[PDB]
């Protein structure tokens, strides 16, 4: 069995408006081993299938993937947006990618401020961010940007916003762009 770095929790958030927003985030599995991401991944629903509403976060073990989170408090989030009719291309590469990244340890000397990765199945259009805990930690902020941004490949002319959830939650919003 060969270890990761650092022990991830996958989360399911419902779309059921009938409950608060924190009791429709549900634990899946933890995992801990290369091998147990794969059994995790090759047998669990593509964020594709998931119903319009519904995420999927990857969270370092003991960092619940909400805002309220004292590792995300002060944080912010990488947000990729997902033009709708490119779903079926994109989102679950971009996912995959992204859940590589995490797991992979990619973002090197930056990697303790990262807090995982949100994926949001939305009619509108989809979202992938990564979060990180201090939206304050530019050069942080910054590299977690450029790294994650070349790995998924998004055109290089266009640019990706980071926001801070501090702003998201007081919206009526970028504080990096990269
Ligand atoms: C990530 N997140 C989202 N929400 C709530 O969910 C709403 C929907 O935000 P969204 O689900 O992230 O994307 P969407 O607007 O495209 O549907 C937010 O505006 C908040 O009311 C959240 N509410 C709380 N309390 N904590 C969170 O971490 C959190």
Redesign the pocket.
């Known amino acids: 069995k060969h270890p990761l770095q650092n022990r991830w929790a996958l989360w399911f958030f419902k779309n059921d408006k009938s409950k608060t927003?924190?009791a429709n985030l549900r634990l899946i599995s933890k995992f801990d081993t290369v091998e147990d991401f794969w059994a995790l991944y090759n047998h669990i629903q593509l964020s594709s299938n998931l119903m319009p509403?519904c995420?999927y976060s990857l969270f370092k073990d003991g960092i619940e993937?909400?805002?309220?989170d004292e590792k995300?408090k002060r944080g912010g989030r990488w947000l990729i947006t997902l033009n709708k009719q490119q779903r079926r291309s994109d989102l679950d590469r971009f996912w995959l990618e992204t859940l590589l990244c995490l797991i992979g340890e990619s973002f090197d000397d930056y990697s303790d401020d990262v807090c995982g990765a949100?994926v949001?199945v939305?009619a509108?259009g989809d979202?992938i961010a990564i979060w990180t805990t201090e939206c304050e930690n530019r050069d942080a902020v910054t590299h977690i940007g450029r790294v994650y941004k070349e790995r998924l490949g998004l055109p290089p002319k266009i640019v990706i916003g980071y926001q801070s959830?501090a702003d998201?939650?007081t919206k009526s919003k970028n504080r990096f762009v990269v």
């Open positions: 927003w924190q509403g995420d993937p909400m805002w309220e995300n949100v949001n939305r509108k979202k959830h998201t939650a």
